[PDB]
Amino acid sequence: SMSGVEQQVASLSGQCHHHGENLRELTTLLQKLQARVDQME
Amino acid sequence: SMSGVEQQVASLSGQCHHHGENLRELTTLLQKLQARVDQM
Amino acid sequence: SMSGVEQQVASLSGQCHHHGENLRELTTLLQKLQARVDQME
């Protein structure tokens, strides 16, 4: 059972990392969209 | 407790999937707003 | 080991929650941008 938890924790860590990289990319795109909107005003 | 840790990991797996759902929703709303800015 | 696994689970739990707070942050900036763009049309 211990080894099964270790493997699922590793799976959760990879998904957690993937979500973190997606957050950073969405943050970049949002900041680019903010600048375009401000330039259009 | 092995069972206890197993239930915590199932909890985190659920929060993970929920976060993944929120990311997809935020991505779709960003694409719609970006298209609205392009149309202007 | 069971305590070592409880800690990694605790690591991940902290990150998940940080991720939630970043999602809420981005949702809010997106909602303010949506309003801003609505005022430009």
PDB file of C-alpha atoms in Angstrom:
ATOM      1  CA  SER A   1       0.000   0.000   0.000  1.00  0.00           C
ATOM      2  CA  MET A   2       2.918   2.303   0.783  1.00  0.00           C
ATOM      3  CA  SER A   3       4.369   1.892  -2.708  1.00  0.00           C
ATOM      4  CA  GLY A   4       0.966   2.588  -4.250  1.00  0.00           C
ATOM      5  CA  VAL A   5       0.765   5.880  -2.361  1.00  0.00           C
ATOM      6  CA  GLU A   6       4.312   6.790  -3.421  1.00  0.00           C
ATOM      7  CA  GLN A   7       3.451   6.265  -7.093  1.00  0.00           C
ATOM      8  CA  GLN A   8       0.229   8.275  -6.900  1.00  0.00           C
ATOM      9  CA  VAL A   9       2.033  11.090  -5.073  1.00  0.00           C
ATOM     10  CA  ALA A  10       4.521  11.170  -7.956  1.00  0.00           C
ATOM     11  CA  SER A  11       1.595  11.306 -10.395  1.00  0.00           C
ATOM     12  CA  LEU A  12       0.011  14.164  -8.437  1.00  0.00           C
ATOM     13  CA  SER A  13       3.332  16.034  -8.409  1.00  0.00           C
ATOM     14  CA  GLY A  14       3.582  15.918 -12.198  1.00  0.00           C
ATOM     15  CA  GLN A  15       0.024  17.169 -12.623  1.00  0.00           C
ATOM     16  CA  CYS A  16       0.739  19.837  -9.998  1.00  0.00           C
ATOM     17  CA  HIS A  17       3.789  20.958 -11.978  1.00  0.00           C
ATOM     18  CA  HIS A  18       1.798  20.982 -15.224  1.00  0.00           C
ATOM     19  CA  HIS A  19      -0.877  23.160 -13.618  1.00  0.00           C
ATOM     20  CA  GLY A  20       1.824  25.525 -12.371  1.00  0.00           C
ATOM     21  CA  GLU A  21       3.264  25.943 -15.857  1.00  0.00           C
ATOM     22  CA  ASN A  22      -0.236  26.523 -17.233  1.00  0.00           C
ATOM     23  CA  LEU A  23      -0.849  29.202 -14.590  1.00  0.00           C
ATOM     24  CA  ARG A  24       2.370  30.988 -15.552  1.00  0.00           C
ATOM     25  CA  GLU A  25       1.447  30.915 -19.243  1.00  0.00           C
ATOM     26  CA  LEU A  26      -2.074  32.193 -18.561  1.00  0.00           C
ATOM     27  CA  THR A  27      -0.555  34.942 -16.404  1.00  0.00           C
ATOM     28  CA  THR A  28       1.725  35.943 -19.282  1.00  0.00           C
ATOM     29  CA  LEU A  29      -1.138  36.070 -21.782  1.00  0.00           C
ATOM     30  CA  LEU A  30      -3.316  38.065 -19.382  1.00  0.00           C
ATOM     31  CA  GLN A  31      -0.549  40.629 -18.857  1.00  0.00           C
ATOM     32  CA  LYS A  32      -0.102  40.930 -22.624  1.00  0.00           C
ATOM     33  CA  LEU A  33      -3.853  41.437 -23.016  1.00  0.00           C
ATOM     34  CA  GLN A  34      -3.839  44.085 -20.282  1.00  0.00           C
ATOM     35  CA  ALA A  35      -1.139  46.034 -22.120  1.00  0.00           C
ATOM     36  CA  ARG A  36      -2.975  45.867 -25.448  1.00  0.00           C
ATOM     37  CA  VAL A  37      -6.232  47.063 -23.864  1.00  0.00           C
ATOM     38  CA  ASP A  38      -4.395  49.912 -22.130  1.00  0.00           C
ATOM     39  CA  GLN A  39      -2.722  50.867 -25.412  1.00  0.00           C
ATOM     40  CA  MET A  40      -6.110  50.869 -27.156  1.00  0.00           C
ATOM     41  CA  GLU A  41      -7.504  53.335 -24.594  1.00  0.00           C
TER      42      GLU A  41
ATOM     43  CA  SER B   1      -2.358   5.264   8.949  1.00  0.00           C
ATOM     44  CA  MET B   2      -1.932   3.874   5.429  1.00  0.00           C
ATOM     45  CA  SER B   3      -5.668   4.201   4.787  1.00  0.00           C
ATOM     46  CA  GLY B   4      -5.609   7.770   6.084  1.00  0.00           C
ATOM     47  CA  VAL B   5      -2.796   8.807   3.747  1.00  0.00           C
ATOM     48  CA  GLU B   6      -4.580   7.027   0.888  1.00  0.00           C
ATOM     49  CA  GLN B   7      -7.680   9.144   1.536  1.00  0.00           C
ATOM     50  CA  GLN B   8      -5.626  12.343   1.668  1.00  0.00           C
ATOM     51  CA  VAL B   9      -4.040  11.487  -1.687  1.00  0.00           C
ATOM     52  CA  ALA B  10      -7.490  10.859  -3.165  1.00  0.00           C
ATOM     53  CA  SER B  11      -8.526  14.267  -1.805  1.00  0.00           C
ATOM     54  CA  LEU B  12      -5.558  15.997  -3.439  1.00  0.00           C
ATOM     55  CA  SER B  13      -6.331  14.149  -6.679  1.00  0.00           C
ATOM     56  CA  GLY B  14      -9.815  15.664  -6.574  1.00  0.00           C
ATOM     57  CA  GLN B  15      -8.545  19.189  -5.911  1.00  0.00           C
ATOM     58  CA  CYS B  16      -6.005  18.683  -8.704  1.00  0.00           C
ATOM     59  CA  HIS B  17      -8.748  17.769 -11.192  1.00  0.00           C
ATOM     60  CA  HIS B  18     -10.842  20.719  -9.998  1.00  0.00           C
ATOM     61  CA  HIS B  19      -7.875  23.047 -10.555  1.00  0.00           C
ATOM     62  CA  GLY B  20      -7.502  21.553 -14.032  1.00  0.00           C
ATOM     63  CA  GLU B  21     -11.157  22.312 -14.728  1.00  0.00           C
ATOM     64  CA  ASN B  22     -10.747  25.921 -13.579  1.00  0.00           C
ATOM     65  CA  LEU B  23      -7.663  26.328 -15.781  1.00  0.00           C
ATOM     66  CA  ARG B  24      -9.570  25.141 -18.858  1.00  0.00           C
ATOM     67  CA  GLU B  25     -12.476  27.485 -18.093  1.00  0.00           C
ATOM     68  CA  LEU B  26     -10.133  30.439 -17.578  1.00  0.00           C
ATOM     69  CA  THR B  27      -8.362  29.550 -20.822  1.00  0.00           C
ATOM     70  CA  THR B  28     -11.609  29.573 -22.806  1.00  0.00           C
ATOM     71  CA  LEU B  29     -12.691  32.907 -21.318  1.00  0.00           C
ATOM     72  CA  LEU B  30      -9.270  34.387 -22.124  1.00  0.00           C
ATOM     73  CA  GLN B  31      -9.580  33.292 -25.764  1.00  0.00           C
ATOM     74  CA  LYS B  32     -13.022  34.885 -26.043  1.00  0.00           C
ATOM     75  CA  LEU B  33     -11.812  38.172 -24.560  1.00  0.00           C
ATOM     76  CA  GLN B  34      -8.711  38.102 -26.766  1.00  0.00           C
ATOM     77  CA  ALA B  35     -10.968  37.622 -29.787  1.00  0.00           C
ATOM     78  CA  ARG B  36     -13.106  40.534 -28.590  1.00  0.00           C
ATOM     79  CA  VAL B  37     -10.004  42.736 -28.429  1.00  0.00           C
ATOM     80  CA  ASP B  38      -8.928  41.638 -31.914  1.00  0.00           C
ATOM     81  CA  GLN B  39     -12.340  42.586 -33.315  1.00  0.00           C
ATOM     82  CA  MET B  40     -11.916  46.116 -31.944  1.00  0.00           C
TER      83      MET B  40
ATOM     84  CA  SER C   1       8.366   6.066   5.636  1.00  0.00           C
ATOM     85  CA  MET C   2       4.661   6.560   6.402  1.00  0.00           C
ATOM     86  CA  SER C   3       5.574   9.872   7.998  1.00  0.00           C
ATOM     87  CA  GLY C   4       7.848  10.746   5.066  1.00  0.00           C
ATOM     88  CA  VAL C   5       4.893  10.089   2.765  1.00  0.00           C
ATOM     89  CA  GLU C   6       2.640  12.183   5.005  1.00  0.00           C
ATOM     90  CA  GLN C   7       5.030  15.058   4.449  1.00  0.00           C
ATOM     91  CA  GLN C   8       5.204  14.858   0.668  1.00  0.00           C
ATOM     92  CA  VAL C   9       1.396  14.692   0.754  1.00  0.00           C
ATOM     93  CA  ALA C  10       1.627  17.858   2.887  1.00  0.00           C
ATOM     94  CA  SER C  11       4.007  19.491   0.421  1.00  0.00           C
ATOM     95  CA  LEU C  12       1.542  18.765  -2.386  1.00  0.00           C
ATOM     96  CA  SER C  13      -1.404  19.956  -0.333  1.00  0.00           C
ATOM     97  CA  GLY C  14       0.301  23.298   0.183  1.00  0.00           C
ATOM     98  CA  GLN C  15       0.987  23.692  -3.526  1.00  0.00           C
ATOM     99  CA  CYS C  16      -2.547  22.785  -4.459  1.00  0.00           C
ATOM    100  CA  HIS C  17      -3.791  25.565  -2.226  1.00  0.00           C
ATOM    101  CA  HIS C  18      -1.273  28.088  -3.520  1.00  0.00           C
ATOM    102  CA  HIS C  19      -2.525  27.072  -6.988  1.00  0.00           C
ATOM    103  CA  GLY C  20      -6.093  27.760  -5.942  1.00  0.00           C
ATOM    104  CA  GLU C  21      -5.166  31.223  -4.749  1.00  0.00           C
ATOM    105  CA  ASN C  22      -3.420  31.922  -8.053  1.00  0.00           C
ATOM    106  CA  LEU C  23      -6.542  30.759  -9.936  1.00  0.00           C
ATOM    107  CA  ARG C  24      -8.750  33.127  -7.912  1.00  0.00           C
ATOM    108  CA  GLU C  25      -6.242  35.933  -8.556  1.00  0.00           C
ATOM    109  CA  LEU C  26      -6.314  35.318 -12.307  1.00  0.00           C
ATOM    110  CA  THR C  27     -10.106  34.957 -12.399  1.00  0.00           C
ATOM    111  CA  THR C  28     -10.303  38.434 -10.865  1.00  0.00           C
ATOM    112  CA  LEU C  29      -7.932  40.108 -13.281  1.00  0.00           C
ATOM    113  CA  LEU C  30      -9.822  38.453 -16.117  1.00  0.00           C
ATOM    114  CA  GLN C  31     -13.120  39.774 -14.745  1.00  0.00           C
ATOM    115  CA  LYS C  32     -11.732  43.299 -14.513  1.00  0.00           C
ATOM    116  CA  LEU C  33     -10.368  43.060 -18.046  1.00  0.00           C
ATOM    117  CA  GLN C  34     -13.772  41.830 -19.270  1.00  0.00           C
ATOM    118  CA  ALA C  35     -15.401  44.917 -17.788  1.00  0.00           C
ATOM    119  CA  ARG C  36     -12.689  47.220 -19.140  1.00  0.00           C
ATOM    120  CA  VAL C  37     -13.117  45.810 -22.667  1.00  0.00           C
ATOM    121  CA  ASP C  38     -16.904  46.046 -22.323  1.00  0.00           C
ATOM    122  CA  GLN C  39     -16.497  49.805 -21.725  1.00  0.00           C
ATOM    123  CA  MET C  40     -14.426  50.156 -24.903  1.00  0.00           C
ATOM    124  CA  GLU C  41     -17.323  48.820 -27.037  1.00  0.00           C
TER     125      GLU C  41
END
